[PDB]
DNA sequence: AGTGATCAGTGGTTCCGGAACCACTGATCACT
DNA sequence: AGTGATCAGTGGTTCCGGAACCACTGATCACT
């Protein structure tokens, strides 16, 4: 059986009609913009999700004709849990299995002395008696109250047992036995208690190991790990400005120490002798939104003073397995956790219960390794995971949940993944497939393309040049006759990415020293300037930590004298050799309808002035503003410049319809009359970057921003192509162009976080190109990449590792691609060998 | 492959572990209470839904260990669309295909004169010219302005065409041609216009046939069909009581016609001369929640004065196909609509476009027939469909949507279905299966059980007697060795339901005459009294209409002098032969935690008094109230009687935990000390109906209500079994017992709407039994049923039909089962033959 | 000349709680 | 004796809108 799309014309799709094989690893490929995400995500996923949800208890319809074989679909991608209560543990369901394990095996200790607790059955004490006492001894059985009094004979077994038990009933689980002869006394408990102090540990159940249960969570943090401590970002007195009388009362006591109308001893205003600003705003928090107000403004979430950030109460933290309480265990990297579960030797009475439990835990602990997250710890906040880390956890969870019958759609799951781990991701993708799921992956990575069960190539190119199936079938087929597609060619060899054959050398260098932020091993980084630098290393090695959470803020402050948070470090040297810093991370473009490529990269400004220079617009009052659809005056006022009004009808969601006044041109007739070389302002939003780049050859300032958009490959996009309809690789690329178009000083530092995300072989080519051009002008470019085609072109490389997590944070290697490719201390080098 | 439940212990499930075959028609069967709904719905569906939804963009966990092979699951059952905009058409997606059809073919007429509109191409008029005019004529081509002036020669074809076109450009689609020789003039339009009046019909598109589009809906009702007309349920002046000054102004003008402080001429207060109460409260509606206030209270939704309730604007209503505008078409029963589409003979140029469209519409129009809803019309409000009608529409839609890979779980889909249509439902169930879905049906119907690909029988009996797989495998297997289950036996023949062999005769009769409510053909029903009556007939025949929406309210008013709405009719006769009327419809029990069987059927009252009679409770102040957990005094005040407190934690949903004070017994220690025959009040909520029925043999009033619960089969339920945890066949049965326990007059009328819903062969037996016992005491019992085992036992039958919809509403037949089984004018009789 | 650092105005996101309404319990009144 | 027709108190359902917050456009100022 197979999935059968027919009449697919979403976005730029050209009414295509493709048969996708069910239960296979299908990779959909294509140059960024081609619209293969519009087929994977906005058609297939979007309909399989729809058809399902609308069959439930309902509280858009993707433009397709029909789709046979469609199944409930799930999209996996970069989507953070947001709430403070999610750990890697909880999110993968693994923590729960753990909560049961610690419940079943694992001994409680004393919540204060740490001494292992003790309890005995009536079996165990009846047996104690016959060891400590001589058969024939006359004994008393008490209840802390005479219960029985007899002779310790084997013949009296049940009498003893009956009385032993009764003694615990009345004794509240406590029974005393006296050796009437010797005077020796023995007190016992059918329940857990400390020998050194006599306190009764709680009821051992999974609920106790749950920092999301009243039974498990810490008393003064509710299992969150942190509390809400007011922060001296409260200083006129910033949090008092909703009642002037407040500000005055303290001013009157200030004038009582002899001051008007900041002078030393500010410590009083802040604490008191009476009531300080701090404890007062802290009291307002307890004694009460306006609870929300003070959370956003004056409050910093600090670690829980009591549990230490361990979330669990004092008791739960006292149950141990081979020395580790459940939290301690979740702190081991998921691979240490694994071995711990293995070098675990439990009595066979124990290994009889745990048994399968223990296997169930290890099976999905592995799915985490198999996806390359073996460096994480379950204790890890879901909150603080990269997008790629999130993406691969959903993959492991979903393959763990063993759900079957669905169509999974993944967008570029190699994001954040070293070339070294690609092998294992493909192996997990195929496993998620062998549960009997259709796995559809939008990817650009060759290794993944080569492992596809079926490929579908969309193009030829972006925008109107896409929406067509330029190839479909097997890998062998595509490599047997590749003349058919740009993807086929980059695999065949026809097109390739050139290793610039001459390395560059610096003119100065940057030296950030003693970098201790996160897992970075108190390192000393020297960054060559005026060269193309790369930062590589396996996931978890510390790339983002160093480059983006330390190096970046730090320069921003030594350059803009600003107060940005940054990673721990000792010093920076030679920062005067750069005089501006531009950064482009992976975050998403702000999407409004009031925005298109032209307005976003600002070229439209220059174009608005050109139109306001036309004799006709000079003849009238017209200036540049007349030509903005976001400004009253020359836009269409029916639809406020939108090109559509909003029709309000009863009992239905609002529906937007074309503006009948302006026809959706979104300008008033008068403005549409001003023309340059024959076209009005609306006509100019209809042309592609390539079209506009021609039209404007002679207008230098315009042609420039345009050229950039063309150079990054975006040359095929409509200027007015609204921001919302923008694809991911475009939007990133526009955000890219928006920065790359501001003239450079010749000594600016460009920081790029995985710039090749959402980029095809082809787009990457134009990219490394543009980047080379940037350094020639004496500019420094740092990129964090796992993409080998971008790494071959660096003149310097700083390789972090050797592994991820706590087993990384080391500069394992540095030098040119070549110096790195000979270094056997580096994985990056081990793969950089087969491209040099 | 197969689904594999392991460690299933939801509700009364006994930790069972069943393998269900994937892609099969699986019927799960069992005596009502057995907990087979807890496995179908609360385990399988509940998890397949969960695992899916939690994989999406999340904004309980059914107690099971593991479930392999699980797929996204969908439950189909009695669940109304609630909104005023849903029709059968829209809900099945069929209307949309229709909107396209009327767009593609189907001629517009004049929105007022009804004269078919006309337009011509430049091709059509160029050709007209050469017919009307003699080749050689000199002509002028105008624009309503001389465009051209030439000679009508074939040699001038393009000149004419070019000018013809230009003439329409400037002419606004209008071109005039003069025969300069003859004086004859011809005006043409490239667009639709009326020859008799010259108005331009709108842009013909699907959006125009959409009463949910600004383009399609009616102007003064927005495609809803009705408006909001204030109703004289406004009379001190009920809608003026939020401003006394109002009531006074009118009182001062009343005292100006000479009245204080109702006297004839009330018409003024209501309308004015100045402003009446009605137009004013009507003005408050337009000129403005408090819009909501007046909707609930003083306003009645009346039909739209303009569109007539047709929803569509005047234009859309003017496009016709073979004489019918799109609404007219949706009024035909889905089977007339079908034939209409067939006896439709469209020109081959037409049948080339519509072609597949027309087939796509007919395919799913059939799924409606195949499920037995051929009697409906697309125009039918989704709002006013029975639960069973809803259920089978989702089935047709879902089989229409061709979705595949999911597990469908249906609860008793024969609800509302005549025995005659069961054949076709099974055929649809198997079709929904052959798309490659697992179809799991909780059913009791033998015909469906016999068509199962795989059966799973749960029991032995209800409550603690269930939760076990008492058989699984094929139909043949079960009938080859049936000694294994109560279901197996009712098929084998071992157990059977006896046709009471002696019919009863009335002592009087009820005669409701001229019943015209809904589709009932102005009929005259005579109801025999003191006998067991049944009302039968195919879905849509009018059973609910007659018995429940006319007969019922009508008696309620002639008995309670109340003002209930009722179906249209002329008169009632002999209503004095009954002096009380009890009714039990299919609606659901109000579910609170403050309720159990014992409190619901009120027996717990009698039990509370017994406990307040105990010497110990007499010795103290205690009365009956002390023994209610819903009253302050003797319940547990920690948990307000709930048996659990609510723990509020941060950032997580509330979690309820056992009350540590009362241990979940929900009474304070003092009360728990009063005992009767050795058990406190809590202990008595723990015992089953059968247990309690023993315990209380000698307490007559108690034993009675209990006996009822035992007689309907409910003898196995915990008295304190909370209302929420109640199954459907139980809850209905409790609601049943709650009425059947009030002593009868000996002349009360009992009306039961499908009382055998959610009932097993076995429960039906105990039911017809109880019902017989009720008539012996001279009581009249009317039941609406399709269940043949209940119908064999009637002494009279009133068969409605012969079909559903407008082709029903006739009393096709009456008499005893036998008199009916010989009547070939009746389907009921045609199946009642094989059980007599 | 081109910038960045601003500000107003505007759109997208997201992240929650109440009011009204209806059903059940368990009491009394007004009775058969 | 047991009812139904009441009423208060309480729980379940359901059916919605704003405020705050953040991003983008496109202007001016203060400059290189
Ligand atoms: Zn201790
Ligand atoms: Zn804490
Ligand atoms: Zn407009
Ligand atoms: Zn007309
Ligand atoms: Zn209307
Ligand atoms: Zn309690």
**Please, which positions of strand C sit below 7 A from a protein CB?**
2-5, 9-13, 15, 20-21, 23-27
Which one, of B319, B318, B370, B364, lies nearest residue B341 by Cα?
A: B364
On the 0-12 / 13-18 / 19+ scale of CB atoms within 10 A, A683 is middle
Rounded to whole angstroms, how far apart are CA atoms B209 and B330?
A: 12
Nearest-CB residue to B72 (from A222, A394, A405): A405
**HEC per residue, A54-120:** CCCCCCCCCCCCEEECCCCEEEECCCCCCCCCCEHHHHCCHHHHHHHHHHHCCEEECCCCCCECECC
One domain, residues A693 and A799:
yes
Q: What sign results for the dihedral spanned by CA atoms B823, B828, B833, B836?
A: negative
Rounded to whole angstroms, how far apart are CA atoms A333 and A285?
A: 37
Rounded to whole angstroms, how far apart are CA atoms B56 and B49?
A: 11
Q: Which ligand is nearest to the CA of B110?
A: 4
Q: What is the resolution of this structure in A?
A: 2.9
Pairing between β-strand A780-784 and β-strand A796-801 as defined by DSSP bridges: unpaired
Residue B306 structural domain: 109-119+192-230+299-318
One domain, residues B166 and B242:
no
For residue A311, the CA-to-ligand 2 centroid distance in Å is 5
In degrees, rounded to 5, the angle at the alpha carbon of residue B697 between the alpha carbons of residues B691 and B699 is 120
One domain, residues B362 and B458:
yes
User: What would the DSSP string read from start to end of A166-229?
Assistant: HHHHHHTSEEEEEETTT--EEEEESS-B-TTT-------SGGGG-TTSTTTB-TTTTTSSEEEE
- Spanning CA of B240 to C1' of D20, the rounded length in angstroms is 39
> Which one of B479, B494, B509 terminates a domain?
B494
A645-653, Cβ contacts within 8 angstroms, sequence gap of 24 or more: A647/B214, A649/B212, A649/B214, A649/B217, A649/B222, A649/B223, A650/B222, A650/B224, A651/B83, A651/B84, A651/B85, A651/B224, A652/B85, A652/B212
Which one, of A105, A347, A307, A97, lies nearest residue A204 by Cα?
A: A105
Whether nucleic acid strand C comes within 7 Å of the CB of B682, the answer is no
Q: Is the peptide bond before B460 cis (omega within 30 degrees of 0)?
A: yes
Helix (H) or strand (E) holding B427: helix B422-431
Nucleotide closest in space to A701 (CA vs C1')? C2
Phi/psi at B779 (5° precision): -100, 145
Rounded to whole angstroms, how far apart are CA atoms B714 and B729?
A: 10
Residue of B404, B439, B644 for testing the chain A interface, max A β-carbons within 10 Å: B404
One domain, residues B580 and B697:
yes
Contact check, Cβ <8 Å, B51/A401:
yes
One domain, residues B397 and B501:
no
Measured between CA atoms, the residue of chain A closest to residue B393 is: A55
One domain, residues B113 and B207:
yes
Distance between alpha carbon A622 and the CA centroid of its chain, in Å?
48
One domain, residues B448 and B545:
no
Measured between CA atoms, the residue of chain A closest to residue B391 is: A55
Contact B216, B210 (CB under 8 A): yes
Nucleotide closest in space to A629 (CA vs C1')? D25
For residue A628, the CA-to-ligand 3 centroid distance in Å is 13
Residue B645 in marked binding region: no
**HEC per residue, B536-557:** ECCCCCCHHHHHHHHHHHHHHH
Contact A310, A293 (CB under 8 A): no
Helix (H) or strand (E) holding B739: helix B728-740
Q: Mutual orientation of helices B728-740 and B700-711 as an angle, nearest 10°? A: 140
One domain, residues B606 and B662:
no
For residue B154, the CA-to-ligand 3 centroid distance in Å is 46
Rounded to whole angstroms, how far apart are CA atoms B567 and B561?
A: 17
Question: How many other CB atoms are found less than 10 A from the CB of residue A755?
Answer: 28
Which residue's entry shows tokens 């739960």? A316
Radius of gyration of chain A (CA): 34
Phi/psi at B761 (5° precision): -40, -45
**Please, which positions of strand D sit below 7 A from a protein CB?**
2-5, 9-13, 15, 20-21, 23-27
Q: Which chain A residues contact residue B394 at CB under 8 A?
A: 55
One domain, residues A459 and A351:
yes
One domain, residues B478 and B585:
no
Q: Which two tokens stand for residue B304?
A: 């739209």
Binding residues of A for ATP: 30-37, 537-544
Phi/psi at B610 (5° precision): -55, -45
> Which one of B472, B494, B516 terminates a domain?
B494
Q: Which chain B residues contact residue A51 at CB under 8 A?
A: 401, 403
- Spanning CA of B250 to C1' of C29, the rounded length in angstroms is 39
Contact check, Cβ <8 Å, A224/B436:
no
Whether nucleic acid strand D comes within 7 Å of the CB of A625, the answer is yes
DSSP state letter for A532: E
> Which residues make beta-bridge pairs with A532?
A781
DSSP state letter for A331: H
Contact check, Cβ <8 Å, A70/B402:
yes
Q: How far is CA B314 from CA A399, A476, A650, B86, in A?
A: 56, 61, 19, 20
Q: Which two tokens stand for residue A815?
A: 């030098």
The tally of CA atoms less than 13 A away on the side-chain side of residue B82 is 4
Contact B40, B439 (CB under 8 A): no
DSSP state letter for B743: P
Contact check, Cβ <8 Å, A56/B70:
no
Nucleotide closest in space to B701 (CA vs C1')? D2
Which one, of A316, A305, A308, lies nearest residue A217 by Cα?
A: A316
Question: How many other CB atoms are found less than 10 A from the CB of residue A170?
Answer: 14
Contacts of B202 (CB under 8 A, 6+ apart): B208, B215, B315
Whether nucleic acid strand D comes within 7 Å of the CB of A394, the answer is no
Rounded to whole angstroms, how far apart are CA atoms A360 and A97?
A: 8
One domain, residues A360 and A478:
yes
Which one, of B823, B773, B771, lies nearest residue B798 by Cα?
A: B823
B306-309, Cβ contacts within 8 angstroms, sequence gap of 24 or more: B306/B218, B306/B219, B306/B220, B306/B221, B307/B218, B307/B221, B307/B225, B309/B225, B309/B226
Elucidation technique? X-ray
CATH of the domain at B365: 3.40.50.300
Which residues are found with C-beta within 5 Å of the ion, ligand 3?
A 636, 638-639, 659, 661-662
Nearest-CB residue to B404 (from A71, A83, A222): A71
- Spanning CA of A742 to C1' of D31, the rounded length in angstroms is 16
Which residues are found with C-beta within 5 Å of the ion, ligand 2?
A 218, 221, 304, 306-307
Measured between CA atoms, the residue of chain B closest to residue A396 is: B55
Question: How many other CB atoms are found less than 10 A from the CB of residue A636?
Answer: 23
Q: Which chain B residues contact residue A402 at CB under 8 A?
A: 68, 70
> Which one of A494, A514, A535 terminates a domain?
A494
Nearest CA distance, B485 vs chain A (angstrom): 33
Residue of A7, A23, A52 for testing the chain B interface, max B β-carbons within 10 Å: A52
On the 0-12 / 13-18 / 19+ scale of CB atoms within 10 A, B235 is middle
Which residue's entry shows tokens 């990129």? A783
Residue of A3, A7, A55, A92 for testing the chain B interface, max B β-carbons within 10 Å: A55
Rounded to whole angstroms, how far apart are CA atoms A466 and A31?
A: 9
Residue B808 in 3-state DSSP?
coil
Residues 624-683 of A with CB under 7 A from strand C: 640, 642
Side by side, the strands of the sheet bearing B66-68 are B19-21, B2-6, B66-68
Q: Which two tokens stand for residue B292?
A: 């909501």
Q: What sign results for the dihedral spanned by CA atoms A78, A81, A83, A84?
A: negative
Whether nucleic acid strand C comes within 7 Å of the CB of A132, the answer is no
Q: Structurally, how many domains does chain B consist of?
A: 6
Rounded to whole angstroms, how far apart are CA atoms A488 and A482?
A: 4
Rounded to whole angstroms, how far apart are CA atoms A669 and A637?
A: 11
DSSP state letter for B39: H
Q: What sign results for the dihedral spanned by CA atoms B158, B164, B165, B166?
A: positive
Measured between CA atoms, the residue of chain A closest to residue B72 is: A72
One domain, residues A309 and A207:
yes
């Amino acid at each position: 059986n197979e999935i059968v799309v027919k009449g697919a014309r979403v976005h730029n799709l050209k009414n295509i009609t493709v048969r996708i094989p069910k239960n296979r690893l299908v990779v959909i490929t294509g140059v960024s913009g081609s619209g293969k995400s519009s087929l994977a995500m906005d058609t297939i996923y979007a309909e399989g999700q729809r058809r399902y949800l609308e069959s439930l208890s309902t509280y858009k319809k993707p433009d397709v004709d029909e789709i046979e074989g469609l199944s409930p679909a799930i999209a996996i991608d970069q989507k953070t849990s947001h709430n403070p209560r999610s750990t890697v543990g909880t999110v993968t369901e693994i923590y729960d299995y753990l909560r049961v394990l610690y419940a079943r095996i694992g001994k409680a200790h004393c919540p204060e002395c740490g001494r292992p607790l003790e309890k005995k059955s009536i079996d165990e004490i009846l047996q104690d008696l016959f060891n400590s006492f001589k058969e024939g001894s006359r004994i008393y059985i008490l209840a802390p109250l005479v219960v029985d009094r007899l002779i310790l004979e084997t013949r009296n077994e049940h009498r003893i047992l009956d009385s032993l038990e009764l003694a615990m009933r009345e004794g509240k689980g406590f029974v005393e036995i006296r050796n009437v002869d010797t005077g020796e006394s023995k007190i016992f408990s059918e329940n857990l208690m400390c020998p050194v102090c006599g306190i009764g540990f709680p009821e051992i159940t999974p609920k106790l190991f749950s920092f999301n249960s009243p039974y498990g969570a810490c008393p003064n943090c509710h299992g969150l790990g942190f509390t809400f401590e007011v922060d001296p970002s409260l200083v006129a007195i910033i949090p008092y400005r909703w009642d002037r009388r407040l500000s005055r009362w303290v001013a009157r006591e200030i004038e009582k120490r002899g001051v008007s109308p900041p002078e030393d001893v500010k410590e009083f205003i802040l604490y008191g002798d009476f009531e300080g600003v701090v404890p007062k705003v802290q009291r307002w928090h307890r004694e009460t939104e306006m609870k929300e107000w003070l959370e956003k403004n004056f409050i910093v979430q600090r670690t829980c003073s009591v549990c230490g950030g361990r979330r669990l109460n004092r008791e739960a933290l006292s149950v141990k397995i081979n020395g580790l309480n459940i939290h301690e265990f979740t702190e081991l990297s998921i691979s240490e956790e694994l071995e711990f579960l293995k070098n675990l030797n439990l009595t066979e009475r124990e290994r009889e219960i745990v048994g399968e439990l223990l296997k169930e835990i290890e099976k999905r602990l592995e799915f985490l390794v198999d996806v390359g997250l073996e460096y994480l710890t379950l204790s890890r906040s879901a909150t603080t995971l990269s997008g790629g880390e999130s993406q691969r956890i959903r993959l492991a969870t979903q393959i763990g949940s063993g759900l079957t019958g669905v169509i999974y759609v993944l967008d570029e799951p190699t994001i954040g993944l070293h070339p070294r781990d690609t092998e294992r991701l493909i192996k997990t993708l195929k496993k998620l497939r062998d549960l009997g799921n259709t796995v559809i992956v939008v990817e650009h990575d060759e290794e993944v393309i080569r492992n596809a069960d079926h490929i579908i190539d969309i193009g030829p190119g972006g925008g109107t040049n896409g929406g067509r199936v330029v190839f479909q079938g097997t890998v062998d087929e595509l490599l047997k006759n590749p003349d058919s597609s740009l993807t086929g060619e980059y695999l065949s060899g026809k097109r390739k990415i050139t290793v610039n054959k001459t390395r560059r050398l610096p003119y100065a260098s940057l030296k950030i020293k003693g970098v201790r932020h996160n897992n970075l091993k108190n390192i000393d980084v020297e960054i060559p300037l005026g060269v193309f630098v790369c930062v590589t290393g396996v996931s978890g090695s510390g790339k983002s930590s160093l480059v983006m959470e330390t190096l970046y803020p730090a320069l921003m402050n030594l350059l803009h004298k600003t107060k940005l948070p940054a990673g721990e470090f000792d010093s920076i040297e030679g920062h005067e050799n750069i005089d501006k810093m531009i950064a482009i991370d992976q975050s998403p473009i702000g999407r409004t309808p009031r925005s298109n490529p032209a307005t976003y990269t600002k070229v439209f400004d220059e174009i608005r002035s050109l139109f306001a220079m036309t004799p006709a617009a000079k003849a009238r009052g017209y200036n540049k503003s007349r030509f903005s659809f976001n400004l009253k005056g020359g836009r269409c006022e029916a639809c406020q410049g939108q090109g559509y009004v909003k029709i309000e009808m009863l009992f239905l969601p609002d529906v937007y319809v074309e503006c009948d006044v302006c026809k959706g041109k979104r300008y008033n007739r008068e403005t549409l009359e001003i023309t340059y070389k024959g076209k009005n302002i609306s006509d100019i939003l209809d042309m592609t970057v390539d079209e506009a780049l021609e039209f404007f050859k002679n207008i230098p300032s315009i042609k420039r921003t345009l050229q950039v958009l063309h150079d990054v490959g975006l040359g095929y996009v409509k200027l007015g192509q609204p921001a919302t309809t923008l694809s991911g690789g475009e939007a990133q690329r526009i955000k890219l162009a928006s920065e790359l178009r501001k003239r450079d000083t010749g000594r600016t530092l460009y920081i790029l976080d995985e710039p090749t995300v959402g980029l095809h072989f082809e787009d990457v080519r134009k990219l490394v190109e543009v980047l080379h051009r940037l350094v020639d002008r004496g500019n420094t470019v740092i990129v964090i990449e796992h993409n080998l085609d971008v790494i071959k072109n660096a003149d310097h490389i700083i390789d972090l590792g050797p592994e991820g997590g706590k087993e990384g944070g080391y500069i394992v290697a540095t030098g040119t691609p070549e110096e790195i490719a000979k270094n056997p201390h580096s994985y990056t080098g081990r793969f950089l060998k087969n491209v040099l």
